Design a protein around this nucleic acid. Structure first.
Ligand SMILES: [K+]
Ligand SMILES: [Mg+2]
Ligand SMILES: [Mg+2]
Ligand SMILES: [Mg+2]
Length: 222
RNA sequence: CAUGGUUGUCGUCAGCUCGUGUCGUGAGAUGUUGGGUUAAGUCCCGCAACGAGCGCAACCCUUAUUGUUAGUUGCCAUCAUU
């Protein structure tokens, strides 16, 4: 990646000055118009390190989970994670998704079962009311657990967009000792993420750019 | 005021709970809360909760129309007689 790519993506922008985090001054270059400016030089070095770390993790054969519910991030993380073949959560992270992984598997099994009924032909013979209700249920299960529907085990790495937004996701990660590679913003906390990627979380283009670098890293590892 | 069984009661009110997870040092909490909505914890949405069970609802009986099968002990429109 190039610092110019970042600048076009608008990565350098941060949040309002008052809404920053003092711990983020280690990666803040200067403040403009009441807003902070990330240090894109540290950004370039750190994104390189994250690409390297993601490549190493993929080479280990572990499983990667890309998390983002931010409107700027949901579609981007979905596409990039699907492109990498690794699993994603885009709409809403369910409490206990990983800590209660066992229970969530029951819902995933339900989702697979409802699909089998459709393929089997039960849906055709099901009464109008029954089939309609199952479509609604199936839709919700796909809506929530769809992006990880076929995950075999607990992920060995979690990529995150705006951990401050995905507070619960970071908490589950820490509980399970899952290393986190995160898009940390000027208002976010760096101490909670192993591999920090100082970047604007509120730019669609920037989220796509960073997620694309990471998806490329994992694909290259595989 | 040793009990089984049976029964009254709130009340046919929509409540009562558990599994896993999570929070709290702990008793506990969460879900069951909230915006809607319903007769309903009925249901949608959101939510560190995800599910599940007893409930609720439906399955049951009866009444309101009617198709067909049956047509005597029942019915009499078409018919003729009492
Ligand atoms: K519990
Ligand atoms: Mg209650
Ligand atoms: Mg209910
Ligand atoms: Mg809720």
């Amino acid at each position: 990646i190039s610092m110019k790519q970042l600048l076009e993506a608008g990565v350098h922008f941060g949040h309002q000055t008052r809404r920053w985090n003092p711990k983020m001054k280690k990666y803040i270059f200067t403040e403009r118009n009441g807003i902070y400016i990330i240090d894109l030089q540290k950004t370039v070095k750190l994104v390189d390190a994250a690409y390297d770390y993601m490549k190493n993790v993929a080479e280990e054969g572990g499983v990667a989970l890309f998390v983002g519910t931010k409107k700027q991030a949901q579609e981007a993380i979905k596409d990039e994670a699907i492109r990498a073949g690794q699993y994603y959560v885009n709409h809403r992270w369910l409490g206990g998704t990983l800590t209660n992984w066992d229970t969530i598997q029951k819902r995933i099994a339900r989702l697979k079962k409802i699909n089998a009924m459709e393929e089997d032909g039960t849906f055709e013979v099901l009464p109008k009311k029954e089939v309609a209700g199952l479509n609604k249920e199936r839709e919700r299960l796909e809506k929530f657990l769809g992006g990880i529907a076929d995950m075999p085990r607990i992920p060995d790495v979690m990529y995150i967009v705006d951990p401050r937004k995905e507070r619960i996701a970071v908490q589950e990660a820490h509980k399970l000792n899952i290393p986190i590679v995160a898009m940390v913003d000027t208002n976010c906390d760096p101490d909670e993420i192993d591999v920090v990627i100082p970047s604007n979380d509120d730019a669609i283009r920037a989220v796509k750019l960073i997620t694309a670098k990471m998806a490329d890293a994992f694909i290259e590892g595989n």
